Amino acid sequence: ETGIGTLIIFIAMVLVAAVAATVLINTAGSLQQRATSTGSQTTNQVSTGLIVQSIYGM
């Protein structure tokens, strides 16, 4: 009967959907750390600087 064949494919459908879910989570986690670090590094880059007061010679 059709009942047996339906159950077999059902298991396969669940496993496939889990794979595509894993890709999206892993990619978002990788891009999270890069975007956070870039923001913090740029903030330090703009604000920081050195200034010359006076120059003397002998």
Partner 1 sequence: DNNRSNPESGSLNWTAIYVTLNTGSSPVDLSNVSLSLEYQGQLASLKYTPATTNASF
In angstroms, the CA 12 to CA 43 distance is: 49
Nearer to partner 1, 26 or 42 (CB): 42
Interface contacts to partner 1, rule CB under 8 A: 34, 37-38, 41-42, 45
The nearest distance, CB 54 to partner 1, in angstroms, is: 27
Token pair belonging to 44: 């330090």
The nearest distance, CB 4 to partner 1, in angstroms, is: 53
The nearest distance, CB 45 to partner 1, in angstroms, is: 5
How far are the Cα atoms of 1, 11, 17, 28, 50 from residue 7, in angstroms, in the given order? Answer: 11, 7, 16, 33, 71
